Amino acid sequence: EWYSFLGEAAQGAWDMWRAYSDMREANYIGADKYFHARGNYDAAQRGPGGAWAAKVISDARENSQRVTDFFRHGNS
Amino acid sequence: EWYSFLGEAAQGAWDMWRAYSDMREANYIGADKYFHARGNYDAAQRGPGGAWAAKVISDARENSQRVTDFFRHGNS
Amino acid sequence: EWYSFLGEAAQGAWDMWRAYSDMREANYIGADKYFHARGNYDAAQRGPGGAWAAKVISDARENSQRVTDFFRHGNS
Amino acid sequence: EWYSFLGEAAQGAWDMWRAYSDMREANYIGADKYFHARGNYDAAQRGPGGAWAAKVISDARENSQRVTDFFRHGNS
Amino acid sequence: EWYSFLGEAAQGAWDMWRAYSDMREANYIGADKYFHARGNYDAAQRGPGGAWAAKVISDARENSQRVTDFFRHGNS
Amino acid sequence: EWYSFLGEAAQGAWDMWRAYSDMREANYIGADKYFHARGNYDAAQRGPGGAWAAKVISDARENSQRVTDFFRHGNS
Amino acid sequence: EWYSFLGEAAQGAWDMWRAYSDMREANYIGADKYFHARGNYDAAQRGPGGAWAAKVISDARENSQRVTDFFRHGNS
Amino acid sequence: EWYSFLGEAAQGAWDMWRAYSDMREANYIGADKYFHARGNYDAAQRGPGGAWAAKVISDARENSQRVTDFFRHGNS
Amino acid sequence: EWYSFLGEAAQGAWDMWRAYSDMREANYIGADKYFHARGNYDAAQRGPGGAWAAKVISDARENSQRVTDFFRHGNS
Amino acid sequence: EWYSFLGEAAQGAWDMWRAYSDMREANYIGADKYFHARGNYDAAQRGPGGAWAAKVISDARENSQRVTDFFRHGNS
């Protein structure tokens, strides 16, 4: 008897591995690059503002589980 | 008896692996690049504003499970 | 007896793997590139604003399962 | 009897490992780079402001579990 | 009897290890770099302000668990 | 605009009520009543045994819902 | 705009109420009543045994909900 | 705008109330009543035994909820 | 704007109240009543034994909640 | 703006009250009543034994809550 319901099961070699995750300069918020500027934004309003968040994540687990009413008996 | 319901099962070599994930400069929000500007945005309003979020993720698991009323008996 | 209902089952070599995921500069929101500008957006309103979100994801699992009333008996 | 419900199970060599996570300069908020500027932002208002947060994470686990009413009996 | 519900189980060699986590210069908030500037921000207001936080984390665990009503009996 | 998808909506009087639920002596498991017995069950084995449960419920709700990607805008 | 998805909504009088739930002597497990017995069950084995539970409930709610990615904007 | 997803909402009088819950002598486990007995159960084994639980509940709430990524903006 | 997700909301009189919960003599475990007995259970073994619990509850709340990533903005 | 997620909210009179909880003689464990007995249980073993608990509760709250990443902004 071998049962699985949501399962990462590996019975061998070089299985389910992950090598390269490459995210360079992913998230620029309200930034400027390689420019020449004169007198712009006179008396202006520029973001970020209000209620906000910026998140950068590579690997993360946030599982949740609900186990109830589990009965197990052996050999009779 | 071998049963699975939602299952990642590998019984061999070099199975289900993932090598390259390449997302360079994916998410620019309200940014400028390689420009020449004079006197623009006079007394203007520029975002980001309000209620917002920017998220960049490579690998993430957020499973949830509900197990109820599970009965197991052996040999009689 | 071998049963599956929704199942990723591999019994061999070099099966179900995924190598290259390439999404460069995928998501530019309200950004400008390689321009020359004078006096535009005078007293104007420019987004992003309000209630919004930008998300870039490569690999993600968000399964959910509901298991109820599972009975198992052995040999008599 | 081998059962799993949400399970990372490896019965071999070189399985489920993760080598490279590369996120350089991921999150620039209200920053400028490689520019020449004169007299801009006269009497202007510039973010970040309000209620906000910036988070950069590589590896993180935030699981939660709810186990109730678990009964186990042996051999009779 | 071998059961797991949320489980990192390794029965071998070189399994589930993690080698490189590389996040250089990830989080610049309201910073400037490699620039020449004259007379900008005259009588202006510049962030960061208000209620905010910046966090950079490599590895972190924040699990929580709720175990109730667990009954175990041996051999009869 | 009035929309419903799975909905118990009552706009009146004396609607959808439930008065009498009468289940007397519903569930007798391995019980005997009003008998005369001599010497039966000599060296015998009688249930209940193994992995089992008996539940009697009158009213119970165990709904579950999955809401994703809900966007609402007002008047322009 | 009035929307509901799974909803108990009452806009009146004497709606959706529940008065009588009557379950007398519902659950007798391995019990005997009104009998005369001599010498039975000599050297015998009688249940309840193993892994089991008996539960009697009148009213109970065990809902669960999953809300994700909800965006709301007002008037423009 | 009035929205509900799983909701007990009453806008009136005498709605959704519950008056009588009557469960007398519901749960007798291994009990005997109104009998005359001689010499039975000689050298016998009688339950309850093993891993078991008996629970009687009238009213109980065990809800659980998962709220993520909720954005709200006002009037512009 | 009026929103609810799992909500007991009453906007009136005599709503959602509960008056009578009557569970007399609900849970007798290994008890005897109104009997005449001679010489039974000679050298016998009688439960309760092992790992067990008996619980009687009238009203109880055991909710749990998970709130994450909640953003609220006002009027602009 | 009026929002609730798991909420007991009453905006009126005589709402959500609970008057009578009546559980007389609910939990008798290994007790005898109104009997005449001679010479029974000769050299016998009688429960309760092992690891067990008996609990009787009328009203009890055991909530738990997990609040994370909550951002609130006012008027702009």
Author numbering:
A (entry chain A), B (entry chain C), C (entry chain E), D (entry chain B), E (entry chain D), F (entry chain J), ...: 19 to 94
The authors write:
Specifically, AA amyloidosis represents a systemic disease characterized by the deposition of misfolded serum amyloid A protein (SAA) in multiple organs. This 12–14 kDa remarkably conserved apo-lipoprotein acts as molecular mop to remove membrane debris and lipid degradation products from inflammatory injury sites. As part of the host innate response to inflammation, acute-phase SAA is secreted by the liver to increase serum levels up to 1000-fold. Chronic inflammation leads to sustained increased SAA concentrations, to an extent that macrophages reportedly fail to prevent proteolysis-resistant oligomers during lysosomal degradation.
